[PDB]
Amino acid sequence: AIHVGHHTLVFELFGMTFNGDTILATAVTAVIVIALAFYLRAKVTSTGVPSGVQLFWEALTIQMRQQIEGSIGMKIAPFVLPLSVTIFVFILISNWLAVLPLQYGGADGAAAELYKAPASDINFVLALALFVFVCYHAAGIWRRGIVGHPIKVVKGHVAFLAPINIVEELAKPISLALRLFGNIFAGGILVALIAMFPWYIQWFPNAVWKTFDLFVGLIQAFIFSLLTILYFSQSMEL
Amino acid sequence: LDPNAIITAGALIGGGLIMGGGAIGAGIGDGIAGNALISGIARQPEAQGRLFTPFFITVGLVEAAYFINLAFMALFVFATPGLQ
Amino acid sequence: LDPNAIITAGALIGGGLIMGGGAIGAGIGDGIAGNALISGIARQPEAQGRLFTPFFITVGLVEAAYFINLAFMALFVFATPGLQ
Amino acid sequence: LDPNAIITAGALIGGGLIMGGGAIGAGIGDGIAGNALISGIARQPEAQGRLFTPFFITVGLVEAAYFINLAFMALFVFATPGLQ
Amino acid sequence: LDPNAIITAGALIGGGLIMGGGAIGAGIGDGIAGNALISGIARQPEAQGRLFTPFFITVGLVEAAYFINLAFMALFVFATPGLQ
Amino acid sequence: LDPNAIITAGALIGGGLIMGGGAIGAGIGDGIAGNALISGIARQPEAQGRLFTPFFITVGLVEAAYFINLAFMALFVFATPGLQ
Amino acid sequence: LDPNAIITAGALIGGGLIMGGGAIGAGIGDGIAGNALISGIARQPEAQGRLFTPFFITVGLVEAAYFINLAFMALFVFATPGLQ
Amino acid sequence: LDPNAIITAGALIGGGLIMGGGAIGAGIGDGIAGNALISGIARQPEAQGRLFTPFFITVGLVEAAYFINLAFMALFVFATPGLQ
Amino acid sequence: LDPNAIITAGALIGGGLIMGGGAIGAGIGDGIAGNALISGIARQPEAQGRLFTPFFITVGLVEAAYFINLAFMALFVFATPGLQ
Amino acid sequence: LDPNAIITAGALIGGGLIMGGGAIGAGIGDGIAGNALISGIARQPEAQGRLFTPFFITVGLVEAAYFINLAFMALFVFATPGLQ
Amino acid sequence: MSIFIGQLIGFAVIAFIIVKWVVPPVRTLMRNQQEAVRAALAESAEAAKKLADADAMHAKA
Amino acid sequence: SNFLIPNGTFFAVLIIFLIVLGVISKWVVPPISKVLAEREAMLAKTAADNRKSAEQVAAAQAD
């Protein structure tokens, strides 16, 4: 009784299945992010002491802009800044929302969580990774032409390794997705595993693992955004 | 005998192999990255903040493998491909 | 031939693999991190308090994996998925 | 006994071995590369910007093998060659 | 065949794997920590006394992983889970 | 019990071992070579170009074996020797 | 088929794994400790007598683990747990 | 159960083991030797010409161990000893 | 099915595991010790003889374990414990 | 089934393990010794002649074990002990 | 219910840890950044005042 | 069931992400960049004003 996967609120539409729980978690994360954005919009000031939300947002912007400037000049690739900031905040909020105590007994002795981190669903990570993939490949095409960019990526650094280079490209999105998936998917299992204990024993491993999971979510958001920025930099260098 | 029995035994062995390999890789890689971090901090103490950005990047690239392996291990033992 | 016997033997082998990999990873990673710590304390003793911060981080990233493996091993041998 | 069941158990064990080896290699190689990167950044802070150019090149190769293994693992478990 | 026979063979194989991994990890980690200690003492005599404290920590973290495996191996071969 | 099934299971396990060993070798060797390359570029920024000639040679030696293994793994899996 | 035969085969494989892991750990740990000792004596000849103290503390640990494994190997192969 | 089937399965597993070990050794040894070569060239460009002399020896002592393994795999897989 | 056949197969697999572990440990430990010896002789040629004393100790340790493994291999394959 | 079939399969698996371990040990030890030799020659050209004598000794220890393994593998595969 | 109770106690432990050892340093960092911004604004204002006084002195002399 | 199989959810989540991106593109990053640039310009202006006051006070007695 571990019930791995088994999405809830699953509904069909236009002949396509949809995981209601994943959509709901993503929508809650987006609502939190948009609320933070519009709360900054109402309290963004340069002539006074900044608020906490302004400090958080500008720290994120400073970090992402520093990474971009280090890798690819902000003149060439300005959009990468909002892209990376959005990716980071989205992943971080979605991962950290799992820390809340929303696990219970699903009337059958198996743990059920009202909110599950959307990154534990392959659809979420695939959407993010493929959006990034298309984004920086389009950027590279614009930078180096329709035919120039594919030739450059195939040739890589030494032409004699042309096969591996191709694989590397295919590994860029997959590595971005699976990594995140795993780092969050494992969490969804461990908590479930820890739910097999009695409460008086379940409380302690649950606390330890969920603290470590807070750390893991922070690191995963950081890595995903940084690798996105650096893939843009690689794809946009002449 | 029951085909699912041997299929599940093979799935459990394969998942064990996946998890063991992932654990070996992640443990050793994290140890090596942490060794680099500790040595760098010992040499020039004021680089502590400066070295954390690459270190975690390394931790991101190393642990990935393990966690990716972990995911597939679940697929082996919870939704076994080829199960009859 | 009881299918549960085959499933349990496979689960025990998988758990043994998980624990072997976790032990290898934990031992070698902790050894490397401790090598860095010992070398740092030998070089610049005053930074001892400074060095224990990254070290405890490194160990934290290593033991974690080990214990994660442990959890899954407990799943394999006590709550064998796919058991009939 | 079902021939397909034996073939599937063998395929699962083979895929587990593939992924274990790939994860060990990826984790340890990425850890070594990250150790080099962290040391280089510690000694030469201004080199970070350039130090990502070779480091990720290495990560390009170390990762490649891994994912290639991963690919074949799928072929083993999802499209088992020789399956009757 | 006796189900207990299969389960006991699997348990023995799993315990052997547990000991193999634990021994590899413990030996290599202790060797690495001791290499750090020996180098530190060779560089500086008076450092010896202050080097033993981190060393005992490292050996404490390495051997722990070993002596956990030990316990579970004893669990595998003396009170085998799932032994029907 | 079809003998072809036993032969195919053995071939799949053997190919898995081939690919796992090749992945370990490729990942660790490429990681070590990349560590050398990154350190060399850190010490001598202008040396970057000069360091690609030997580094890739190492990669060529490290990857070639892997790919040779890959070829043989295909032979094990797609055209199994001794299959009857 | 005699259950004792299967149990003995499992015990022999487990003892083989125990000894393999113990030998790997002992050999590599001894090599690392001896590398430290040789380098230390090379830099500071007079340190020889001094360095033998920590060195024996290292090897003493390493061999211990190996020899511990040895003991259990006997238990596996001479007084097999669960044997009937 | 044709005796040839079991013998061929065992031979395939043995050949896979031989390749796994040979590839691990070849990849890691070539990576280490290439790290040495890259470092040596980085410290001084002009030594390149001389450095390739010992390097070719090292690779020769590594690749040989690999290729010998390859030869024996043929014996295991194409002309299985004791095929009966 | 002769139980002695299963016992002999298990003993052969266990002996192969013992030999593989011993060979890996011996080779890597001897390589590390020889690396230390070569580096020391390069640094201080006048200390060459002085370095041979510790070198023969480390090797004496490493090989010891290896040869011990040989003994038990014989005990496994020529005096297989548990034979019916 | 034929006992000889099972015994031969076990012997082939054991010999494959023997050669895999031997190749891993030989490759990695030769790589480490060659790294020492290459670094020594890079640092001091005059040492080129002097460093061969230790290097060979290291190789002599690294290869010997491997070849011992090789011999025993033949014993496993051509004169399988316990065959009947 | 038992699962809910156990995970709720675990979350209480997490919250206690956060408030005891994570909230203080983070709030200190935020306060330091706010005070730095306020100090920068104060320096800007007093520099404008300094320039005004310098212009006044130039007019006098 | 195989949880690695993408589902229609892939699209829905994507859309949500895009929406967030839009907001972050037009109500978080532009204002924050403007604020940071204003702060940098303010620091530069403060330094320039201090320098101007110093040189002016020197010139007062010099002239």
Measured N-to-C along each axis, helices A199-235 and A162-194 cross at an angle, to the nearest 10 degrees, of 160
d(CA C25, CA C46): 30
Question: Which residues contact residue I8 at a Cβ distance below 8 angstroms, ignoring those fewer than 6 apart?
Answer: I80, J6, J7, J10, J81, J82, J83, J84
φ and ψ at residue A16, rounded to 5 degrees? -120, 135
Residue of chain F nearest A159, judged by CA positions: F56
**Whether E79 contacts C12, CB under 8 Å:** no
- A48 secondary structure, DSSP code: S
Q: Is residue B44 part of a domain?
A: yes
What dihedral do alpha carbons F23, F27, F33, F36 form, nearest 10°? -160
Which among B25, B33, B68 is the nearest to D34, CB-wise? Answer: B33
Q: Is residue E51 part of a domain?
A: yes
Token pair listed for G34 = 């001896």
In three-state form (DSSP H/G/I as H, E/B as E, the rest C), the secondary structure along I29-54 is HHHHHHHHHHHHHHHCHHHHHHHHHH
Chosen for mutation from E46, E68, E77, E84 (greatest number of chain C CBs closer than 10 Å) is E68
φ and ψ at residue I16, rounded to 5 degrees? -60, -40
Q: How many CB atoms lie within 10 A of CB F1?
A: 12
d(CA A86, CA C28): 38
- B44 secondary structure, DSSP code: S
Measured N-to-C along each axis, helices E3-43 and G48-78 cross at an angle, to the nearest 10 degrees, of 180
**Whether H2 contacts H83, CB under 8 Å:** no
Q: Which of H84, G80, J1 is nearest to I80 (CA)?
A: G80
Alpha carbon distances (Å) from L56 to A222, K61, L52: 49, 11, 6
| CB-CB neighbors (< 8 A) of C80 in chain A | none
Taking the CA atoms of chain E, what radius of gyration do you get in angstroms?
19
3-class DSSP state for residue K33?
helix
d(CA L40, CA A88): 25
Q: Which of B31, B17, J40 is nearest to D15 (CA)?
A: B17
Phi-psi region of H82 (alpha: psi -120 to 50; beta: other; left: phi over 0): left
d(CA H73, CA H17): 9
Q: Is residue H45 part of a domain?
A: yes
DSSP, residue by residue, chain C: --HHHHHHHHHHHHHHHHHHHHHHHHHHHHHHHHHHHHHHHHH-GGGHHHHHHHHHHHHHHHHHHHHHHHHHHHHHHHS-TT--
DSSP, residue by residue, chain L: --TTS--THHHHHHHHHHHHHHHHHHHTHHHHHHHHHHHHHHHHHHHHHHHHHHHHHHHHHH-
Taking the Cβ of residue D49 and every Cβ of chain A, the question of whether any pair is shorter than 8 Å is answered with yes
């330091």: which residue's tokens? K32
d(CA G31, CA E66): 20
Alpha carbon distances (Å) from F55 to A141, D56, F36, F83, H41: 29, 14, 8, 41, 10
φ and ψ at residue H39, rounded to 5 degrees? -60, -50
| CB-CB neighbors (< 8 A) of H15 in chain F | 14, 76
d(CA E4, CA E2): 5
In three-state form (DSSP H/G/I as H, E/B as E, the rest C), the secondary structure along H18-35 is HHHHHHHHHHHHHHHHHH
Alpha carbon distances (Å) from D82 to D10, D69, F42, F79: 11, 19, 50, 9
In three-state form (DSSP H/G/I as H, E/B as E, the rest C), the secondary structure along A90-158 is HHHHHHHHHHCCCEEECCCCCEEECCCCHHHCHHHHHHHHHHHHHHHHHHHHHHHCCCHHHHHHHHCCC
Bridge-based pairing state of the strands A111-113 and A103-105: antiparallel
φ and ψ at residue A111, rounded to 5 degrees? -65, 145
Strand ranges for chain J from DSSP E: none
Which among A2, A178, A189 is the nearest to B68, CB-wise? Answer: A178
φ and ψ at residue C82, rounded to 5 degrees? 75, 5
Measured N-to-C along each axis, helices H48-77 and H3-43 cross at an angle, to the nearest 10 degrees, of 180
H-helix or E-strand spanning residue A18? strand A16-18
Q: Is residue I72 part of a domain?
A: yes
Q: Which of H41, G28, I7 is nearest to E32 (CA)?
A: G28
The method of structure determination was cryo-EM
d(CA A152, CA A141): 10
Q: Which of F31, A215, E31, E71 is nearest to C30 (CA)?
A: E31
- J82 secondary structure, DSSP code: T
| CB-CB neighbors (< 8 A) of C74 in chain A | 193
Q: How many CB atoms lie within 10 A of CB A198?
A: 11
Start-to-end CA span in chain L (Å): 89
Token pair listed for K31 = 């306060």
3-class DSSP state for residue A79?
coil
| b/e G8-17 (16+ beta carbons within 10 angstroms → b) | bbbbbbbbbb
d(CA H71, CA H65): 10
d(CA D77, CA D11): 6
CB contact under 8 A, B60 and A5: no
How many structural domains compose chain G? 1
Taking the Cβ of residue B60 and every Cβ of chain C, the question of whether any pair is shorter than 8 Å is answered with no
**Whether I13 contacts G13, CB under 8 Å:** yes
d(CA I56, CA J58): 11
Start-to-end CA span in chain D (Å): 13
Angle at the Cα of A139 from the Cα atoms of A135 and A143, rounded to 5 degrees: 170
CB contact under 8 A, L21 and A83: yes
Q: Is residue F83 part of a domain?
A: no
Token pair listed for F82 = 């001794």
Chains C/B: 3 or more C-beta pairs closer than 8 A? yes
**Whether A155 contacts A162, CB under 8 Å:** yes
Domain boundaries of chain A, sorted by first residue: 11-235
Token pair listed for B70 = 């972990």
F-facing residues of H in 17-36 (CB < 8 A) are 17, 19-36
């021994």: which residue's tokens? E23
In three-state form (DSSP H/G/I as H, E/B as E, the rest C), the secondary structure along chain G is CCHHHHHHHHHHHHHHHHHHHHHHHHHHHHHHHHHHHHHHHHHCHHHHHHHHHHHHHHHHHHHHHHHHHHHHHHHHHHCCCCCC
The length of chain C is 84
Bridge-based pairing state of the strands A11-13 and A111-113: unpaired
3-class DSSP state for residue F39?
helix
Chains G/E: 3 or more C-beta pairs closer than 8 A? yes
With 0-12 / 13-18 / 19 or more C-beta atoms within 10 angstroms meaning exposed / middle / buried, residue G34 is: buried
Q: Which of A138, A137, A144, A129 is nearest to A227 (CA)?
A: A129
Token pair listed for E35 = 């290499």
């009784």: which residue's tokens? A1
Q: Which of A218, A235, A127, A142 is nearest to L21 (CA)?
A: A127
- Give how far the C-alpha of residue L40 lies from the chain's centroid of Cα atoms, to the nearest Å: 11
CA dihedral over H34, H39, H42, H45, signed as positive or negative: negative
Phi-psi region of A56 (alpha: psi -120 to 50; beta: other; left: phi over 0): alpha
Q: Which of K17, B83, A22 is nearest to L14 (CA)?
A: A22
Question: Which residues contact residue A156 at a Cβ distance below 8 angstroms, ignoring those fewer than 6 apart?
Answer: A162, A164, A165, A168, D60
Q: Which of A209, A224, A21, A23 is nearest to A99 (CA)?
A: A209
Question: Which residues contact residue I12 at a Cβ distance below 8 angstroms, ignoring those fewer than 6 apart?
Answer: I76, I77, J7, J10, J11, J13, J14, J76, J80, J81, J82
CB contact under 8 A, I51 and G42: yes
Q: Is residue D84 part of a domain?
A: no
Partners of residue A113 on adjacent β-strands: A103
Q: How many CB atoms lie within 10 A of CB D50?
A: 17
Partners of residue A103 on adjacent β-strands: A113
Q: Which amino acid is at D47?
A: A
Bridge-based pairing state of the strands A11-13 and A16-18: antiparallel
* SS3 of chain K: helix, strand, coil, percent, to 5: 95, 0, 5
| CB-CB neighbors (< 8 A) of F26 in chain D | 25, 61-62, 65
Which among E17, E25, E58 is the nearest to C16, CB-wise? Answer: E17
**Whether E73 contacts E12, CB under 8 Å:** no
Token pair listed for B39 = 């040595």
CB contact under 8 A, A171 and D61: no
Alpha carbon distances (Å) from J16 to C26, E37, G30, H22: 28, 38, 26, 11
Which among A2, A186, A190 is the nearest to C81, CB-wise? Answer: A2
Which among C19, C28, C43 is the nearest to E28, CB-wise? Answer: C28
């998890």: which residue's tokens? B19
Domain boundaries of chain K, sorted by first residue: 23-61
d(CA L45, CA L38): 10
Looking up residue B60, the CATH number of its domain turns out to be 1.20.20.10
Residue of chain C nearest B40, judged by CA positions: C40
Token pair listed for L53 = 């006051």
Q: Is residue C84 part of a domain?
A: no
Q: Is residue I84 part of a domain?
A: no
**Whether D34 contacts B58, CB under 8 Å:** yes
Distance from CA of K12 to the nearest CA of L (A): 32
Residue of chain E nearest C77, judged by CA positions: E81
3-class DSSP state for residue A16?
strand
- E18 secondary structure, DSSP code: H
- A7 secondary structure, DSSP code: -
φ and ψ at residue A103, rounded to 5 degrees? -100, 140
Q: Which of C7, J20, F15, B3 is nearest to D14 (CA)?
A: F15
H-helix or E-strand spanning residue J5? helix J3-43
| I15: containing domain | 3-79
Token pair listed for H50 = 């001389």
d(CA A77, CA I5): 70
d(CA I18, CA E20): 11
DSSP, residue by residue, A163-181: HHHHHHHHHHHHHHHHHHH
Alpha carbon distances (Å) from B50 to A125, B38, F40: 30, 12, 21
With 0-12 / 13-18 / 19 or more C-beta atoms within 10 angstroms meaning exposed / middle / buried, residue L56 is: middle
CB contact under 8 A, I38 and J43: no
CB contact under 8 A, I24 and G24: yes
**Whether H30 contacts F62, CB under 8 Å:** yes
Taking the CA atoms of chain I, what radius of gyration do you get in angstroms?
19
CB contact under 8 A, A219 and B56: yes
3-class DSSP state for residue I82?
coil
